[model samples]
Target: LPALKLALEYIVPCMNKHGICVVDDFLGKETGQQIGDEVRALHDTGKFTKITWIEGKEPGCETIGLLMSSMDDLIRHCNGKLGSYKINGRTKAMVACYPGNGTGYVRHVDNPNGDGRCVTCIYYLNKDWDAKVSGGILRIFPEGKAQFADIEPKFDRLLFFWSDRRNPHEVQPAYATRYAITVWYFDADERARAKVKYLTGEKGVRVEL
Candidate 1:
């Protein structure tokens, strides 16, 4: 708990200033390797499913499940530190795989339609990933900033950013298979409002919702 608190001291300030923060070696090297191995095995089994305009994904895995079991506390801590919003729950840890076929996601915000998502968290599991060769860098266009940031999906790296329009991001084409687990924290009140809006025909329909 003390360690997490200390980490958040840095994260919160960076997020406030730039709307994004990245932490390296988030879960240690061995744990990240294990998760990567598990994801590769799952992908090999062909159980991962495709999502529209993105790569393949599996909703659960042993390593990720264990990690997420304790993430509620982390989210609580974040809510306390990150002013202006509070997250009540989070989506499952979605293990994602980008095959080495020059595939990438288009530029977009995570919560453009207001599904209540307040924060986007992604833990990358690509071991020894070289940005020059791998080509799967995360390009972020921060609101009001003149310069963009490029993030490499290195092992045991965790990235946190606001899910709203303040942060528009995309994945560059991957030359090698990339692995990452993503979880989005959402506000219950906002979700309810969005749901009501959708039901009453104020907003367009979303199949996932």
Candidate 2:
């Protein structure tokens, strides 16, 4: 409760200063309880679909539904500066978690497609965690110069960032089982479309996928 209470106090003022907002413990309660319920509901009822071994997913369409509902909550809580978005034919993202093996994750750039994702939200869902054993620290690069270096992984800790082609971010995996729901918004405007094309090889990031 303290964490959630703390997040409510800090997130609004901080986001008002900057265009972004992030304060974990927003829902002082464990994300695991809610997200875990959703995950099992899908799996038990045969609604859960096969994911790319990219961990777990509950089908694409359904994922968007969850994304929309959650986004509505976020916007209402944040006073509408932020909004939830959905694409015509892509997963909006309901839940994304990792079954870690203590080895950690690979450092890589996200492949931005279309102009769909304008912003992103990553909320950590774990009740008990160990910093030494579980090392799922999020590293983000804001274009250049500003680096987040390292972020502590805690229950209900949230990370919000703009979804730009140049906003290269990566997950450093963890020693324990980590669960998160990443929500994305897609609006293919002229500028966004152009950026997408450029990143997708029409222009390219000057590197191979």
Index of the highest-TM-score prediction: 1
Off by over 4 Å in 1: 1-3, 50-60, 199-209
**Candidate number with greatest lDDT:** 1
Judge candidate 2 at residue 96 and give its lDDT: 53
Per-model TM against the reference: 0.85, 0.60
Candidate 2, after superposition: displacement of residue 193 in Å?
3.3
* Per-residue C-alpha lDDT of model 1 across residues 1-209, encoded as one tens digit per residue: 35467347866788777788887877787877877777777767666774211122335356666556545556666665675766777776677888879999999998988888888888898888998987999999998889898999998888889898998999999999888888888776777777776552335546663
- Model 2 weakest 10-residue run by lDDT: 48-57
lDDT of each: 0.77, 0.53
Summing lDDT over every window of 10 consecutive residues in candidate 1, give the lowest-scoring window. 51-60
